[PDB]
Amino acid sequence: TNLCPFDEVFNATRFASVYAWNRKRISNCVADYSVLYNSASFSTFKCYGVSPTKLNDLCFTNVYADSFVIRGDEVRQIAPGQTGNIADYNYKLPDDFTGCVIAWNSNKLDSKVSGNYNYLYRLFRKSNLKPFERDISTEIYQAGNKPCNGVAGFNCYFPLRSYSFRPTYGVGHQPYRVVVLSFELLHAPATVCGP
Amino acid sequence: STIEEQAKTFLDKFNHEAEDLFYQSSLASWNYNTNITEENVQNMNNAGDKWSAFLKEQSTLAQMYPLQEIQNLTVKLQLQALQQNGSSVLSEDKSKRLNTILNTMSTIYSTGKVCNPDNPQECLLLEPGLNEIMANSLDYNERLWAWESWRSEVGKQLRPLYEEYVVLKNEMARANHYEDYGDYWRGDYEVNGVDGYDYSRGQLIEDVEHTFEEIKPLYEHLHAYVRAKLMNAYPSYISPIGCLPAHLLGDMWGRFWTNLYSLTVPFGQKPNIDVTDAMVDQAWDAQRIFKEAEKFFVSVGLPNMTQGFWENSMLTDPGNVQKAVCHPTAWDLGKGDFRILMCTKVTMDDFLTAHHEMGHIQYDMAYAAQPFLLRNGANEGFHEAVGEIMSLSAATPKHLKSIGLLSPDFQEDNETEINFLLKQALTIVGTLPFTYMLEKWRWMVFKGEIPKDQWMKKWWEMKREIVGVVEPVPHDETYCDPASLFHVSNDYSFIRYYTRTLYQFQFQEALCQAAKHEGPLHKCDISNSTEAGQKLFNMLRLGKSEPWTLALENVVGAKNMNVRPLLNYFEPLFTWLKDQNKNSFVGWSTDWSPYA
Ligand SMILES: *[C@@H]1O[C@H](CO)[C@@H](O[C@@H]2O[C@H](CO)[C@@H](O)[C@H](O)[C@H]2NC(C)=O)[C@H](O)[C@H]1NC(C)=O
Ligand SMILES: *[C@@H]1O[C@H](CO)[C@@H](O)[C@H](O)[C@H]1NC(C)=O
Ligand SMILES: *[C@@H]1O[C@H](CO)[C@@H](O)[C@H](O)[C@H]1NC(C)=O
Ligand SMILES: *[C@@H]1O[C@H](CO)[C@@H](O)[C@H](O)[C@H]1NC(C)=O
Ligand SMILES: *[C@@H]1O[C@H](CO)[C@@H](O)[C@H](O)[C@H]1NC(C)=O
Ligand SMILES: *[C@@H]1O[C@H](CO)[C@@H](O)[C@H](O)[C@H]1NC(C)=O
């Protein structure tokens, strides 16, 4: 009876930026889907293609946990068939996604009076991201017709920007921690079932 | 990529970077205005410096995007505001003069000294000096002492400076290619590039003149009634076919006729409605005022206040040693931070001001989805005409019964409607000619039809024929009388107080039409009405994304400013006034003078 490392995921001391979202691989363990449905401390808990209860007894090959931190108004963009900055340049989901999305407020941790500048996101990119792709490049975005030479200037911008969370902001501008759980079903013994 | 989508990329960076620096300036100002201290003046200065530097730097860089190669209206609107230089077109030699002139004018207006003759002992200045003197007094000589003391010193010390203030502010506006400084002011109302909704700068003048021609009868009857009741307070010195002397009209300049109510009461022995006693008798605190102003907007159509508004807003005076500047304001700090700073007692004026200040907040939450540069009212009169029709419905003797403050057996006599209508006419109908005349004077001075030596001559001839006010003592070409007012010394526009007045009555009749109200318009109440709230929100949500003509048409169904709803509001009073003036002369002869 090996319990899956859900505490290391939901209870991590520090999370990651959106353009560098964290991926954890869960396999060969017993998963307890009882501290997630029962816990009425989650602001958003939505599953696509799988019923939360009842279907919590089906075997899967591999499980993936993707963790990051966004702002309140952007949580709606973590869903299939959605457009925006986060969905197109930061984190993209496939149309046929099968998994769950969980998001909860983290104002008391990720906000500071002087401003939390440790969190970043991408504003400019040449083209949209393919599903489950991560881009941590820092080349200057060349919007004009002159070479940027890796230095910012007229029609040349640094692609990364900071959220700057503060305690007195509104609900839509407060930080939200997001964890997305994906289930893999392949031609494998699928040693991850859970009671 | 072409120019348009490059400007679109530039504006994304600008909007991301501007919202961060605007929050620190607003919060630093809030800290000062809520807690005055020596060290809380440096943070405000630093934030204001950073914001101004960023704005200037980004305005310099945004002038390499020609407008002629752009077809989308939204990006054009966002670029026009940012591209405008302002006063930087002036040479640095001509830029060290104008700010110095303005600061000297502000200081000399603030630091006044009125001392009675042959007695250098006591001097009372403007606040709370001559303002209190010219608020409650019935002596001709005392009232004709403060009116000439202010114009003798300040005017004679602002005439030489103002003459320069005109010549520079025109040339700047001539470098910005606008014909002069008056047309620069009138450019606020300009709409271009929309078929059927365009509006030129010069058309505002004609639209203003036409409206004033349909208010003359009511103002003449009010003027005649006030003149008839001012011959008894002062047994003489007033002629029955003449102009009212300037020093007998409530406040100093004659901007409001409110303080003449004690002398002009339609039906005495019948007191007005006041619910201060009811509040103070059954334990009304400072929050219940702000808890019932919420249930009004919530009742009609609108969302409730945020949690941060109930914990980050100063709603009651702090007292003790900590100092707070009391002035009712409504702050939009950005990032969903709305708060109100006002110290409130338990009275009726505070109750009605609460609705005003909450309407201001409720207009701000609607256009928070627009880009940074398009978050404001449609023009300079839409934002104080929306927060003011909410005080029109929170004072009727039907809303008050429904909340438990006006006795549930109260009767509505028609000898009290006239008393409430004159209180409301001494403030609305008795200030429009003054605003019109002052702005027309400024327009002619800026254009050039008024030569420098016939300045004070034309002032006291438009006082004769437009307002009906005569010199108590004649003035030569050494004073600057308009400079004695606050908005003339300090550079401000003054037409926004006219159009707003005409807007607030166009809105109400529209909303009261959606509430199926029956009876007089002044007895209307938009409560529990889900049809008026949606119509109001369908104008509140836009901001500056669309021309003010379209936003106005969204609510009232007309593309232009109109005066008929204002005349509908004041109808019974008109009949009463016309009936009670069968033995007087309506109008004033422009020959009679107190000094002969
Ligand atoms: C994260 O850590 C907490 C504390 O160690 C775990 O315990 C729960 O904490 C929540 C409040 O944060 C309580 O409402 C629950 O009753 C606690 N449960 C138990 C069994 O103590 C919490 O379970 C951890 N998170 C996860 C996903 O395991
Ligand atoms: C007001 O400002 C002073 C700064 O000298 C500070 O010590 C004090 O705590 C402040 N009070 C409040 C109520 O913010
Ligand atoms: C103008 O730009 C805005 C912002 O990109 C866009 O939403 C709008 O559709 C554009 N106008 C037209 C007519 O497409
Ligand atoms: C406003 O109303 C919503 C529901 O419409 C409610 O959840 C919220 O608590 C209310 N806010 C306040 C301050 O009462
Ligand atoms: C609106 O509804 C409330 C609900 O109690 C009621 O008290 C109030 O009188 C209503 N307003 C009007 C104008 O009737
Ligand atoms: C008030 O109504 C009564 C009854 O119709 C009428 O006689 C009286 O003249 C009215 N008062 C005024 C000021 O019109």
Residue numbers in the entry:
A (entry chain B): 333 to 527
B (entry chain A): 19 to 614
What does the paper behind this entry write?
As the spike glycoprotein of SARS-CoV-2 mediates the virus entry into host cells, it is the main target of NAbs and the hotspot for designing therapeutic agents and vaccines. Omicron carries the most significant number of mutations among all SARS-CoV-2 variants to date, with 37 mutations within its spike protein, 15 of which are positioned at the RBD and cover almost all the critical mutation sites carried by previous VOCs, such as K417N, S477N, E484K (E484A in Omicron), and N501Y. The Omicron spike has 37 mutation sites, 11 located on the N-terminal domain (NTD), 15 on the RBD, and the remaining 11 near the furin cleavage site and on the S2 subunit. To delineate the impact of emerging mutations on spike’s properties, we performed systematic structural analyses on apo Omicron spike and its complexes with human ACE2 or S309 neutralizing antibody (NAb) by cryo-EM.
To test whether the three substitutions of Omicron (S371L, S373P, and S375F) are critical for its stable one-RBD-up conformation, we generated Omicron-S-L371S/P373S/F375S mutant protein with the three residues (L371, P373, and F375) replaced by those (S371, S373, and S375) in the prototypic spike. The purified mutant protein was incubated with hACE2 in the same way to determine the cryo-EM structure. Strikingly, the structure revealed that the mutant spike predominantly exists in the three-RBD-up conformation after ACE2 binding, indicating that these three reverse mutations prime to transform into open conformation when bound to the ACE2 receptor. Local refinement for the RBD-hACE2 region of the complex was performed, and a clear density map was obtained. In addition, the three-RBD-up conformation of hACE2-bound mutant Omicron spike with reverse mutations (L371S, P373S and F375S) reveals the three emerging substitutions of Omicron (S371L, S373P, and S375F) play a crucial role in stabling the one-RBD-up conformation of the spike to fight against the conformational alteration triggered by ACE2 binding.
